[PDB]
Design an enzyme around this catalytic site. Structure first.
Site, PDB file in Angstrom:
ATOM      1  N   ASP A   1      72.696 -57.997  35.256  1.00 22.49           N
ATOM      2  CA  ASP A   1      71.207 -59.602  35.161  1.00 22.49           C
ATOM      3  C   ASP A   1      70.135 -58.682  36.698  1.00 22.49           C
ATOM      4  O   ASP A   1      71.017 -57.760  37.341  1.00 22.49           O
ATOM      5  CB  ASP A   1      71.582 -60.801  36.252  1.00 22.49           C
ATOM      6  CG  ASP A   1      72.059 -61.845  35.062  1.00 22.49           C
ATOM      7  OD1 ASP A   1      72.118 -61.432  33.683  1.00 22.49           O
ATOM      8  OD2 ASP A   1      73.076 -62.395  35.753  1.00 22.49           O
TER       9      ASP A   1
ATOM     10  N   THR B   1      64.324 -61.517  34.296  1.00 20.67           N
ATOM     11  CA  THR B   1      64.421 -60.776  35.895  1.00 20.67           C
ATOM     12  C   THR B   1      63.987 -58.847  35.196  1.00 20.67           C
ATOM     13  O   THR B   1      63.254 -58.723  36.972  1.00 20.67           O
ATOM     14  CB  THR B   1      65.307 -60.774  36.329  1.00 20.67           C
ATOM     15  OG1 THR B   1      66.413 -60.470  35.873  1.00 20.67           O
ATOM     16  CG2 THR B   1      65.387 -62.563  36.728  1.00 20.67           C
ATOM     17  N   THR B   2      64.736 -58.798  34.996  1.00 19.89           N
ATOM     18  CA  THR B   2      64.281 -57.055  34.676  1.00 19.89           C
ATOM     19  C   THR B   2      63.022 -56.720  34.710  1.00 19.89           C
ATOM     20  O   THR B   2      63.095 -55.478  35.230  1.00 19.89           O
ATOM     21  CB  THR B   2      65.665 -56.856  34.681  1.00 19.89           C
ATOM     22  OG1 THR B   2      66.540 -56.835  34.661  1.00 19.89           O
ATOM     23  CG2 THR B   2      65.336 -55.327  33.685  1.00 19.89           C
TER      24      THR B   2
ATOM     25  N   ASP C   1      71.749 -68.553  32.064  1.00 28.49           N
ATOM     26  CA  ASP C   1      70.703 -67.819  30.906  1.00 28.49           C
ATOM     27  C   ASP C   1      70.313 -67.860  29.918  1.00 28.49           C
ATOM     28  O   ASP C   1      68.870 -68.077  29.480  1.00 28.49           O
ATOM     29  CB  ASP C   1      71.228 -65.882  31.042  1.00 28.49           C
ATOM     30  CG  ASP C   1      70.814 -65.547  32.644  1.00 28.49           C
ATOM     31  OD1 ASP C   1      69.743 -66.285  33.951  1.00 28.49           O
ATOM     32  OD2 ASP C   1      70.475 -64.017  32.144  1.00 28.49           O
TER      33      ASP C   1
HETATM   34  N1  LIG Z   1      69.484 -57.383  19.433  1.00 30.63           N
HETATM   35  C1  LIG Z   1      67.961 -56.732  20.042  1.00 30.63           C
HETATM   36  N2  LIG Z   1      66.818 -55.410  19.696  1.00 30.63           N
HETATM   37  C2  LIG Z   1      66.079 -55.344  20.148  1.00 30.63           C
HETATM   38  N3  LIG Z   1      65.518 -55.673  20.887  1.00 30.63           N
HETATM   39  C3  LIG Z   1      65.925 -56.744  21.579  1.00 30.63           C
HETATM   40  C4  LIG Z   1      66.892 -57.407  21.821  1.00 30.63           C
HETATM   41  N4  LIG Z   1      67.578 -58.482  22.064  1.00 30.63           N
HETATM   42  C5  LIG Z   1      66.841 -58.173  23.088  1.00 30.63           C
HETATM   43  N5  LIG Z   1      65.686 -57.394  23.036  1.00 30.63           N
HETATM   44  C6  LIG Z   1      64.778 -57.007  24.227  1.00 30.63           C
HETATM   45  O1  LIG Z   1      64.871 -57.036  25.297  1.00 30.63           O
HETATM   46  C7  LIG Z   1      64.825 -57.835  25.617  1.00 30.63           C
HETATM   47  C8  LIG Z   1      65.381 -58.463  27.192  1.00 30.63           C
HETATM   48  O2  LIG Z   1      65.940 -57.934  28.134  1.00 30.63           O
HETATM   49  P1  LIG Z   1      67.258 -58.479  29.052  1.00 30.63           P
HETATM   50  O3  LIG Z   1      68.189 -57.385  29.587  1.00 30.63           O
HETATM   51  O4  LIG Z   1      66.954 -59.366  28.889  1.00 30.63           O
HETATM   52  O5  LIG Z   1      66.184 -57.759  30.582  1.00 30.63           O
HETATM   53  P2  LIG Z   1      65.252 -59.496  31.606  1.00 30.63           P
HETATM   54  O6  LIG Z   1      67.229 -60.002  31.910  1.00 30.63           O
HETATM   55  O7  LIG Z   1      65.068 -59.053  32.134  1.00 30.63           O
HETATM   56  O8  LIG Z   1      64.750 -61.068  30.374  1.00 30.63           O
HETATM   57  C9  LIG Z   1      63.492 -58.838  25.471  1.00 30.63           C
HETATM   58  O9  LIG Z   1      61.630 -58.302  25.652  1.00 30.63           O
HETATM   59  C10 LIG Z   1      64.316 -58.294  23.913  1.00 30.63           C
HETATM   60  O10 LIG Z   1      62.559 -58.121  23.556  1.00 30.63           O
END
Ligand SMILES: Nc1ncnc2c1ncn2[C@@H]1O[C@H](COP(=O)(O)OP(=O)(O)O)[C@@H](O)[C@H]1O
Ligand SMILES: Nc1ncnc2c1ncn2[C@@H]1O[C@H](COP(=O)(O)OP(=O)(O)O)[C@@H](O)[C@H]1O
Ligand SMILES: Nc1ncnc2c1ncn2[C@@H]1O[C@H](COP(=O)(O)OP(=O)(O)O)[C@@H](O)[C@H]1O
Ligand SMILES: [Mg+2]
Ligand SMILES: [Mg+2]
Ligand SMILES: [Mg+2]
Lengths: 66, 527, 533, 526, 48
Positions: B59, B92-93, B393
């Site tokens: 996270d 958050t990231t 989350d």
């Molecule tokens: N299976 C997937 N394929 C492509 N993109 C993805 C997939 N799962 C999540 N994402 C992308 O990754 C991002 C989520 O990143 P994440 O690590 O959750 O950051 P945060 O915790 O800040 O939301 C989303 O914007 C989404 O578009």
């Protein structure tokens, strides 16, 4: 869940409002003779807390602000 | 040199371009740290505390809090991310990445003598246009089970690995659908998350009932009750002294014995009330009686209850009162002045499980429980903490998807579409704020960049491929993390919360505008 | 041009005492090295030919043993990855009770081979995928390798033979006698009901007469004496009171308010008469032994002595509850005479001296009861502690046998068969995961290799012979300890078997720990600060 | 061994060096926040010694966080605090003006002019400054909400909240209007006590609004309470609903068996009697500043009453003002007039992971809660400071309906008027008079400097324009650097703010000009 | 340097496998002789 200190945040919140005319600072003792001649004075009812410290070492700034 | 230093000799001051350099360097450092977290392919970090505690995490918020940083701008960004996590529960990231890229793009133009005010004006105009486009692009769909499962996947797959995310998706979706009432806000307090440390991480599951971390304190009480009547009470069944300093006076041993016998009559009265209610309700031995008390129960009352075949639990959690009322279906009582079978909850199975020195109690087989529990199981403490964060989350994401009538395509497709729309809208902006609009669009473009970089593909080539495909087809195409080719997020099922995107835009723009306008950083609270 | 400044960004913002390790070389290889070192420290104590290690903790307390979990517990392990492996081993100990050294050795071998794979160009994700596939294949294969089941648990000889192997790695010289003791103790417990409680077995350590003089007592033994003058009862009728053996007093505040001379004259006599009446009423129910959880009053002790009542005072509530379970009484909360249902019975209670220790023995002549006690003798405290550890391992093995009756061959046969089958499976599947699967199979060789190293023979010859025999078709053949030259023999004939559940859980936990360690890419260590515990 | 007249740690400085040091310290204080004045000001980050971070461009917030050793700087800080407390705006302007007057006074102190002559000239100048400001003022119709909104906008156009100008102006105006109160022939506003600003991080700033009532961070005592009541009748209490010891020592003496049980039963009966006395008036919500016993909770629940405990005294007073209730200590004296009828809705809803109690549909409420939602804590703190400035300006306009042109127009007009008046002095005080009159040009000069335009030509053009007859409203556009009539740009400030700023700056200069000897190091001697 | 590091890396495996270093050294010397022979075999002439 009272042990999680829910009231701690709001305690800080109304501890932020120190006073009107600035917030002064913490008194510093110049010499051991000064320490003695400021410590033998006043009365029993006055409670004194004294902090020994050195610059740069961890923990001094936080509790100094405290 | 500076005025503050002249007034306060032992003061730290950063003025003019120095303040901008300091803030931008801090933001870029945070962004560089958090690049490797975005997406399911992001690397996993292990953090060791002072005491030696191990915490595996991915996270943004958890990493920021448990990362040894003592910088002001980092503190502001951490506060913004903390608010983002507190309200929406996700994103958050992305917040840190967007703030850092905004500041870097703004610096790219500020280094040519451009005043930051123009960049901030461009940022505000671009934020307004992007918000309009986000309102245009969101997909309003009735949230059935499939959509909620897809959203839970898009969260947990980033949080944990594949099979664990698959298990957690079903767990969180079923829990939310169980506690959700039509046309009412979702109370996430009704999903108690319990931690057990005796099985594998994939053994975590959802129980349509409640799990209590404490068991019966009397050895003679039954360890398993088939048909149970649940009595949720908040009455001190132990011994309590008089508030007005009673004291006892006697002249003989027999009188002392009489006083000892009569001093517990007050407690024995309510114990007898409970016993009489139990005997009236279930005169046979088929149906059991379970008593949950928020206050303590002395051993005398425990023995008196156990002699009647009644299992009693003391010192329950305060929220467990509401949880049992909604799950079993009884009425919480603060006194036994008038208690009737109408105030008794029902449970189709109550058994106690033992794990080392810790005893757990299961209250299952409720009719239509409005409060369920998630049982986190794992072989390690850090595994339990990681699953806890992932479940938090996922629950926040599902609740946001339920509350919002829409959902936004993920995989960075909406970022690309916003960037293209902002580029198209740039000529409509009058003045030099077009530079700020371009910087804002480039900053929004960071998400596909980081996703492709984490997946191992080339950054610029993948982004140009995605942009060309989106421009030629007009679809919402995102980065495919396995092949790098453009992929339609909506059809595959990569979904993002609309509220998360809106909060990201608002908070990132506000904090970037505020940081860009800082011309001095001071510390003159000493001497 | 004489000082390298810290790079701008995270490097400068890092705290004063913190450390940041990122990347492959700085983090993954270092973690693998630390796990390898930990496995190296624990390696030499594996198998019957393992060697005890004297470990002195931070409190100058001495532990000598070859139990991997105990050695890990009493070592000041500081590395994070080593901490993860240690807690995985502790989890294995909690779940089953044996195989901790197997967990350590397998995790170390897996991480070493993972480092080898990473050096030749494989990626962490591909290595993890291959390890998971091979672990699933091993879990699928394992049930097919079961050679025999328990088939009975109320028997003494069969249970002793089954438990011999578990307590043969520790105390290699004399395992038959310990096997007989633990078999008798476990058969006394474990009634017709399928439940078996580990806590129902008690270990009493009395120093002086060598471990060969140990015995199993059907009851309980307490290291204390009696309060009164009666020291032996032949038809014990214990009555257990959780309350102190004294007249109960009020809870708020007592005050003997004397208003006349006559009340002052009569108060003490009345209190004494009440105490005498209470004790006489207790004794009138036939009770001749009284066990109290509280202090003993002088008047109550005197009146118990007058009526020939044996008084035993138990400090611990756990001891009181265990005694209630053994005798069959109920811990009364007051000083009332006991009714027939709560009237404890025991064949004999007496005060006896073993060595120089005065003990109170609650002994049942019948071969039954809820709690059985093993009296351990010896010439050293550390020796008795190690024997107690071996007894705990045997009891945990019996509990696992009650849970699951399937047994797989020991002595490296199971690991060799698993390695051969996993290699054969991995040769079929194309793709990059075949290297990881083959390395996972090769990691199973560390068990027979460790056994051969500890037995003082050449590991390579033993492994080659094991492969030859297994390729021939004998899947129940392991190395022979009772031979100074590399040799193999059938494990089923020799009865060297270990539980299927132990192998399953150990393999699962070791694989999970190795994969979890490999998943880590960045380490952000805070300042060590304090944390005394 | 040393004789000594004074203590060895007593240090004395006297002569011209003292005056030079004082004036230089005042100029340094001015230079601290010289760049934080005008619509194009820049933020400053302040690192609190307690670990907090203050990010603001407000003069008082910046000055308060700076610790100084030169006592003239301490006087300047006190001046900033006084200006902030008295009117709430003009905090940077007073500091800048004081610095400029002290500089032009040092100019004459270089020569052989006694400070008392400068002080007399300054006081004459201050009187004429007040007269000129009163002359060029214009009346305002307070009933015109558009004028009030424009005034508030001109007040907050130089802060961070200026982006959401309409929202902030509406919030401030509504809060001030509904907090305005009158009783027993006395008219009051009292923004400090009521009109509380509650900030919750998260959400968007556009969602911020002023509630038609009071919101507190409290939850119902029992889960089975009602979290949504349509038209509640609120009863407010100070005394706890528990059983408490008496003041006097009241030890009991029990010799009979049943007395213990009787005592406990009497405790329960007393709690029941108190709850019945509360229930007699048939309310819906009970709010207590102190604890509520579990038995009391059950008794109230039996009557279907929502109970909330441990509410702060200020929050209870605000709720009383909002819902028209009266706080009562002894329930047996509770009367119908004390029941709060007028609240139109009460709802406990969850924000983030916390429970908040809303009483937000009161008809004619005399107290309000301004709910702020934003990016983080620092952003919301800055927004709260801007809202405080807006409300203070609104109350100043309500108390005094006079306005004067802004953007330096008033400064230049007053400077020209005093310069014209000084032509008839024919004495020695004319030079300090003219100098302090022309020192007012620092506000337009600072506005131009912050705008980034050319100071000399713009200021000369402004002076030439002000030399004409009807040009007192000609200021400088702070965001474009061009001369413009302020009756077209529509930037106005309350006359009270300008009067207070001018008076405070002149008095600061007078006070600092009367000092020519500094003695330090002596002990407190309590 | 890289070659020597790799040779010692692959030797450590046998030193951990209860093999005396002298056998490893003899094998290394035989390998070196054969490496020299093979390198001389696959060489090609050049006219200066
Ligand atoms: N299976 C997937 N394929 C492509 N993109 C993805 C997939 N799962 C999540 N994402 C992308 O990754 C991002 C989520 O990143 P994440 O690590 O959750 O950051 P945060 O915790 O800040 O939301 C989303 O914007 C989404 O578009
Ligand atoms: N007589 C024997 N011959 C060969 N191997 C044996 C013999 N007895 C026990 N073993 C082996 O020793 C291993 C047990 O090692 P041990 O020291 O108990 O480690 P752990 O305590 O972690 O199980 C078993 O795998 C078993 O195969
Ligand atoms: N749009 C504008 N154009 C020119 N001057 C302005 C404008 N808005 C405000 N001002 C001037 O800026 C001053 C307010 O600056 P501010 O930062 O509020 O200082 P202070 O905190 O001391 O009041 C007012 O005196 C006003 O004359
Ligand atoms: Mg996320
Ligand atoms: Mg073992
Ligand atoms: Mg102002």
């Amino acid at each position: 869940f009272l042990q999680q200190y829910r009231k701690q945040r709001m305690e800080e919140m109304r501890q932020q409002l120190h006073k009107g005319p600035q917030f002064k600072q913490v008194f510093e003792i110049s010499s051991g003779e000064g320490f003695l001649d400021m410590i033998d004075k006043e009365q029993k009812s006055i409670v004194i807390m004294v902090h020994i410290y050195e610059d740069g070492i961890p923990g001094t700034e936080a509790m100094n602000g405290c | 040199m500076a005025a503050v230093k002249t007034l306060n000799p032992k003061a730290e001051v950063a003025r003019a371009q120095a303040a901008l350099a300091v803030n931008i360097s801090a933001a870029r450092g945070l962004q560089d740290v958090l690049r490797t977290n975005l997406g399911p392919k992001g690397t996993m970090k292990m953090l060791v505390s002072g005491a030696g505690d191990i915490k595996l995490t991915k996270d943004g918020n958890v990493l920021l809090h448990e990362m040894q940083i003592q910088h002001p701008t980092a503190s502001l960004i951490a506060k913004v991310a903390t608010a983002q996590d507190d309200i929406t529960g996700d994103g958050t990231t992305s917040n840190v990445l967007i703030i850092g890229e905004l500041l870097k793009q703004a610096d790219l133009y500020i280094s040519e003598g451009l005043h930051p005010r123009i960049i901030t004006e461009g940022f505000e105009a671009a934020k307004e246009k992007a918000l309009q486009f986000l309102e245009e692009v969101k997909v309003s769909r009735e949230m059935d089970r499939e959509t909620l499962i897809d959203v839970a996947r898009t969260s947990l797959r980033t949080k944990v690995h594949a099979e664990l995310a698959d298990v957690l998706t079903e767990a969180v979706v079923d829990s939310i659908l169980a506690i959700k009432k039509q046309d009412e806000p979702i109370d996430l307090f009704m999903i108690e998350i319990m931690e057990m440390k005796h099985k594998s991480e994939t053994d975590t599951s959802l129980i349509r009932g409640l799990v209590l971390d404490h068991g019966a304190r009397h050895p003679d009480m039954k360890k398993r009750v088939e048909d149970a009547y649940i009595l949720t009470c908040n009455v001190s069944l132990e011994y309590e002294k008089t508030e007005v300093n009673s004291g006892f006076f006697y002249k003989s041993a027999e009188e002392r014995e009489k006083l000892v016998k009569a001093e517990r009559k007050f407690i024995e009265d309510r114990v007898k009330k409970i016993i009489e209610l139990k005997r009236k309700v279930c005169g046979d031995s088929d149906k059991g009686f379970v008593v949950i008390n928020q206050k303590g129960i002395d051993p005398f009352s425990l023995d008196a209850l156990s002699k009647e075949g009644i299992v009693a639990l003391r010192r329950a959690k305060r929220r467990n009162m509401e949880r049992l009322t909604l799950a079993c279906g009884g009425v919480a009582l603060n006194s036994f002045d008038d208690l009737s079978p109408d105030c008794l909850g029902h449970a189709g199975l109550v058994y106690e499980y033992t794990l080392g020195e810790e005893k757990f109690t299961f209250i299952e087989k409720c009719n239509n429980p409005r409060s369920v529990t998630l049982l986190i199981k794992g072989p390690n403490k850090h595994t339990l903490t990681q699953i806890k964060d992932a479940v938090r989350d996922g629950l926040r994401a599902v609740k946001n998807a339920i509350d919002d009538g829409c959902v936004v395509p993920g995989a960075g497709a909406v970022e690309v579409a916003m960037a293209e729309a902002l580029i198209k809208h740039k000529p409509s902006v009058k003045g030099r704020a077009q530079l700020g609009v371009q910087a804002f669009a480039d900053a929004l473009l960071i998400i596909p960049k980081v996703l492709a970089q984490n997946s191992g593909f080339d950054l610029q080539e993948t982004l140009v491929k995605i942009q060309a495909e989106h421009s030629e087809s007009g679809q919402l195409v995102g980065v495919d993390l396995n092949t790098g080719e453009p992929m339609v997020a909506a059809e595959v099922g990569v979904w993002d919360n609309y509220c998360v995107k809106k909060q990201l835009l608002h908070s990132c723009t506000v904090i970037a505008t505020n940081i860009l306008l800082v011309d001095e950083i001071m510390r003159a609270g000493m001497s | 041009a004489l000082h390298v400044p810290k790079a701008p960004g995270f490097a400068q913002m890092l705290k004063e005492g913190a450390k940041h390790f990122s990347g492959l070389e700085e983090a993954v290889y270092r973690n693998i090295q630390a796990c390898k070192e930990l496995a190296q420290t624990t390696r030499t104590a594996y198998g019957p030919n393992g060697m005890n290690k004297m470990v002195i903790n931070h409190l100058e307390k001495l532990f000598v043993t070859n139990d991997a979990a105990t050695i890990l517990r009493e070592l000041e392990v500081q590395h994070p990855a080593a901490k993860m492996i240690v807690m995985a081993s502790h989890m294995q100990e909690q779940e089953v009770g044996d195989g901790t050294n197997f967990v350590l050795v397998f995790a170390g071998a897996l991480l070493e081979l993972a480092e080898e794979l990473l050096r030749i160009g494989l990626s962490v994700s591909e290595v993890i995928e291959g390890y998971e596939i091979a672990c699933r294949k091993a879990h699928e294969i394992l049930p097919n390798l079961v050679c025999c089941s328990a088939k009975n648990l109320r028997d003494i000889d069969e249970v002793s033979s089954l438990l011999r192997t578990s307590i043969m790695s520790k105390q290699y010289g004399n395992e038959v006698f310990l096997a007989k003791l633990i078999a008798q103790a476990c058969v006394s417990i474990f009634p017709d009901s399928g439940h078996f409680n580990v806590d129902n077995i008690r270990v009493c350590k009395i120093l002086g007469s060598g471990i060969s003089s140990s015995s199993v007592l059907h009851g309980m033994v307490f290291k204390k004496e009696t309060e009164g003058d009666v020291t032996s009862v032949k038809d014990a009728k214990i009555a257990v009171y959780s309350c102190p053996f004294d007249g109960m007093i009020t809870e708020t505040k007592g005050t003997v308010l004397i208003k006349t001379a006559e009340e002052l004259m009569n108060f003490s006599k009345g209190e004494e008469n009440l105490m005498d009446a209470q004790v006489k009423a207790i004794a009138d129910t036939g009770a001749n032994v009284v066990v109290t959880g509280g202090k003993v009053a002088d008047m109550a002790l005197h009146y118990a002595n007058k009526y020939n009542i044996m008084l035993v005072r138990l400090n611990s509530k756990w001891d009181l509850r265990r005694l209630c379970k053994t005798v069959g009484a109920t811990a009364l909360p007051r000083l009332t005479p006991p009714v027939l249902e709560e009237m404890g019975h025991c064949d004999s209670v007496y005060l006896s001296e073993v060595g120089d220790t005065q003990v109170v023995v609650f002994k049942h002549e019948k071969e039954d009861g809820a709690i059985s006690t093993i009296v351990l003798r010896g010439s050293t405290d550390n020796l008795m502690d190690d024997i107690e550890r071996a007894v705990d391992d045997g009891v945990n093995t019996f509990k696992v046998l009650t849970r699951d009756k399937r047994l797989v061959p020991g002595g490296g046969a199971t690991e060799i068969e698993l390695a051969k089958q996993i290699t054969s499976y991995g040769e079929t599947c194309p793709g990059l995961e075949q290297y990881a699967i083959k390395k996972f199979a090769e990691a199973f060789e560390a068990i027979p290799r460790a056994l051969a190293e500890n037995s003082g023979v050449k590991a390579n010859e033993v492994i080659s012979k094991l492969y030859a025999v297994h390729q021939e078709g004998n899947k129940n053949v392991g190395l022979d300890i009772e031979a100074e030259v590399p040799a193999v023999k059938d494990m089923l004939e020799a009865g060297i078997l270990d539980t299927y559940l132990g192998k399953y859980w150990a393999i699962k936990l070791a694989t999970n720990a190795a994969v979890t360690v490999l998943r880590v890419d960045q380490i952000i260590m805070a300042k060590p600060a304090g944390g005394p515990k | 061994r040393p004789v000594l007249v004074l203590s060895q740690n007593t240090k004395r400085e006297s002569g011209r060096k003292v005056q030079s040091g004082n004036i230089n310290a005042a100029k340094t204080i001015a230079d601290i926040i010289r760049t934080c004045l005008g619509p194009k000001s820049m933020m400053k980050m302040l690192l609190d010694p307690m670990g907090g971070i203050v990010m603001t461009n407000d003069g008082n917030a910046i000055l308060r966080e700076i610790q100084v050793q030169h006592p003239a700087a301490k006087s300047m800080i006190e001046i900033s605090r006084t200006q902030d407390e008295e009117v709430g705006d003009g905090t940077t302007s007073v500091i800048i003006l004081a610095g400029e007057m002290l500089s032009v006074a040092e100019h004459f102190l270089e020569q052989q002019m006694h400070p008392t002559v400068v002080i007399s000239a300054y006081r004459k100048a201050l009187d004429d400054m007040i007269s000129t400001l009163k002359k060029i003022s214009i009346p305002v119709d307070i009933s015109d909400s558009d004028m009030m909104l424009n005034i508030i906008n001109s007040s907050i156009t130089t802060k961070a909240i200026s982006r959401w100008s309409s929202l902030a102006c509406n919030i401030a105006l509504d809060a001030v209007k509904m907090v305005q109160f009158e009783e027993n022939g006395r008219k009051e506003i009292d923004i400090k006590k009521y009109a509380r600003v509650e900030k919750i991080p998260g959400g968007i700033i556009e969602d911020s609004c002023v509630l038609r009532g009071v919101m507190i961070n409290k939850d119902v005592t029992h889960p089975r309470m009602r979290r949504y009541i349509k038209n509640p009748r609120i009863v407010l209490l100070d005394s706890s609903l528990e059983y408490k010891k008496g003041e006097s020592q009241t030890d009991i003496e029990i010799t009979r068996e049943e007395d213990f049980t009787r005592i406990l039963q009497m405790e329960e009966e007393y709690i029941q009697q108190l709850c019945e006395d509360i229930i007699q008036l048939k309310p819906d919500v009970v709010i207590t500043e102190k604890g509520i016993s579990d038995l009391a909770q059950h008794y109230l629940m039996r009557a279907n009453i929502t109970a909330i405990r441990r509410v702060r005294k200020t929050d209870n007073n605000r709720i009383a003002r909002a819902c028209g209730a009266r706080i009562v200590s002894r329930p047996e004296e509770l009367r119908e007039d004390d029941v709060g009828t007028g609240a139109g809705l009460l709802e406990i809803k969850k924000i983030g992971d916390e429970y908040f109690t809303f009483i937000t549909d009161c008809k004619d409420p005399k107290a309000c809660t301004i709910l702020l939602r934003g990016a983080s804590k620092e952003i919301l703190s800055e927004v709260e400071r801007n809202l405080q400035d807006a409300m203070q300006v609104c109350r100043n306009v309500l108390l005094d309906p006079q306005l004067v042109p802004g953007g330096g127009a008033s400064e230049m007009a007053v400077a020209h008027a005093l310069t014209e008046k000084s032509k008839a002095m024919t004495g020695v005080e004319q030079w300090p008079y003219r100098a302090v009159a022309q020192a007012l040009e620092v506000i337009p000069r600072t506005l131009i400097q912050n705008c980034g335009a050319s100071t000399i030509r713009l200021l000369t053009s402004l002076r030439a324009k002000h030399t004409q007859e009807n040009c007192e409203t000609w200021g400088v556009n702070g965001e474009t650097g061009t001369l413009v009539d302020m009756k077209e740009l529509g930037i106005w400030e309350p006359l009270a703010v300008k009067l207070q700023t001018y008076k405070t700056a002149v008095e600061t200069a007078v006070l600092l000009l009367r000092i020519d000897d500094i003695v330090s190091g002596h002990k407190k001697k309590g």
